[PDB]
RNA sequence: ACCGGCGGACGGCUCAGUAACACGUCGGUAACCUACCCUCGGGAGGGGGAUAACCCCGGGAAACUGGGGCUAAUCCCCCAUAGGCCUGGGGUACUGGAAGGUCCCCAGGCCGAAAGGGAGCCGUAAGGCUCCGCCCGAGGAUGGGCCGGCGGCCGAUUAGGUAGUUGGUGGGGUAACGGCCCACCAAGCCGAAGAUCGGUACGGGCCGUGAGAGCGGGAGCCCGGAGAUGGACACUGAGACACGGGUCC
């Protein structure tokens, strides 16, 4: 699976972006939401990306992604499935007006080979 | 789901056919079958016009009067009966009316725990 | 005693919450008089009103009865036959609105 | 432009359903709710928090929608005090035809406010002086909910109908009374003065016609009711189960 990796330095509000694939990519395909991973064991020349020295042995967490068809993954719903369910508020779902709830499609939790976004933070 | 409206059902024993949709102002709410239990719950509702009303899901105090004025606030053991249903007193259910016993004695409930959120008794003799 | 009604009230006194001259039962509004033909329920009486309509193509008259269901104190506790006066409540059952407040005349 | 406040429940449209407390009229609520408005009596003390807009990177054919950075309020949340509600014991100040009401004193509990904020002058500054505002209590007003007596269609080639059905006792639920709904105890309730069932129909103020008595109609204007492709069901709000808001078939 290929995914487009969407990384946000948390300390300086800069974010840049790339493709990752193959074997590399391979490994990421299982883990949750909100679950550290070393950028080193992942392969990426992190000090090329952003200009700037950066700390050793330095993971990142996943944040947030989008599936292939447009539809975000919302943190607490289990499983790598894509469902339809009525909302209030929360990611997936933006109100405009009082008391306002409407059926949205989201994603779950899980990475899959579907999802083409994967955002990500740095965490020292 | 509840609706307090009206009986479809003339007193000569006819039918009757509804004339409109049942109004938002008519509907009803589950009962609150309040029971014994080692810590005390209640919630809020909101009602019409925007006012409030407290309802007590779990008790394990009460509030005991004698004829002479005073109060005292002890814990609650069990339900003794409860003439308002045959199954009430088994499950320790709490209504206005039911016999429960206490650490000083039995007494008879005289508040609305579902309407009000505290359980009031007076001691028997 | 007096509930505004300005009669004699019942000799004895009872229990019923429901009664006017000895509970919390408040009467306001219409007072009507009538003759019981019916005291099988519990507490429960029908009376029956007869008055005239006029028809006005035939100018002539009609007789026309009204029943009432009361309900029926145990201080008063009137029979079938006999004449009594009735006063409006609250609602009291799904066809109960009227209360018994007086025997006129036992049958 | 965005956050925030008020409004979008009125106004406009149509007459499918409905023979019913739907409508007309006289009464009742001592059995109830009400944002905006009016009068009088009081209050505004101490803390905390995020986030749109904006910057970086985006995803999807579109409808829509993700992560990270930073910020404010008459935005949101706590603590206190005032205040509200329930039950038991006393007292007799108020209104009324009549107090399960209001008022005072003890006692046991539960819930639980607020924005001294904004604008303008005198202010050297200190601080006033108006203007618009925030919260609580008592009453009114406005808009409604609920209840009763009486009044107005056709059919017997439709004669018996009803079993939560009629009433009682104990509860639940509701803004509020009530078989409105439960548990138990009875056998009631309606009917040839037409019940039950079937037909047709929104009701009235009014309109057409006739010497009058009558006979026929009820689209257009006003007052009431109901509906938003058919059938069910919820969120917000003072008020909706909402025509230009949501969910299922
Ligand atoms: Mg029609
Ligand atoms: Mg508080
Ligand atoms: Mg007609
Ligand atoms: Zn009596």
């Known amino acids: ?124 | 789901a509840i609706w307090q409206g009206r009986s479809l059902r003339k007193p000569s024993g006819g039918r009757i056919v509804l004339a409109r949709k049942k109004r938002k102002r008519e509907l009803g709410r589950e009962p609150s079958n309040t029971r014994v239990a080692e810590q005390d719950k209640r919630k809020i509702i909101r009602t019409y016009g925007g006012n409030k009303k407290v309802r007590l899901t779990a008790a394990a105090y009460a509030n005991v009067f004698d004829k002479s004025g005073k109060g005292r606030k002890v814990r609650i053991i069990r339900v003794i009966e409860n003439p308002a249903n045959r199954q009430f007193a088994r499950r320790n259910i709490i209504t206005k009316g039911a016999i429960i016993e206490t650490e000083i004695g039995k007494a008879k409930v005289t508040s609305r725990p579902g309407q009000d959120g505290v359980v009031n008794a007076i001691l028997l003799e | 005693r007096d509930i505004g009604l300005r009669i004699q009230p019942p000799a004895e006194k009872c229990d019923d919450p429901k009664c006017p001259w000895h509970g919390h039962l408040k009467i306001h509004g219409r007072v009507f008089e009538g003759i019981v033909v019916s005291d099988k329920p519990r507490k429960t009486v029908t009376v029956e009103r007869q008055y005239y309509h006029y028809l006005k193509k035939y100018e002539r008259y009609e007789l026309r009865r009204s029943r009432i269901h009361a309900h029926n104190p145990p201080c008063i506790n009137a029979k079938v036959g006999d004449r009594v006066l009735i006063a409006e409540t609250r609602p009291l059952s799904k066809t109960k609105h009227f209360v018994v407040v007086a025997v006129l005349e036992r049958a």
């Open chain 1, 1 to 124: 699976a290929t995914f487009k990796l969407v990384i946000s330095d948390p300390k300086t509000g800069i974010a840049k972006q790339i493709e990752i694939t193959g074997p590399e990519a391979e490994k990421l395909i299982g883990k949750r939401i909100g679950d550290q991973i070393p950028v080193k064991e992942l392969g990426i020349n992190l000090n090329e990306l952003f200009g700037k020295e950066f700390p050793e042995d330095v993971k990142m967490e996943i944040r947030g992604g989008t599936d292939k068809d447009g539809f975000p993954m919302r943190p607490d719903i289990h499983g790598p499935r894509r469902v339809r369910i009525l909302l209030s508020k929360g990611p997936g779902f933006r109100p405009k007006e009082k008391g306002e709830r409407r059926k949205k499609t989201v994603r779950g939790n899980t990475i899959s080979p579907e999802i083409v976004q994967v955002n990500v933070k740095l965490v020292y």
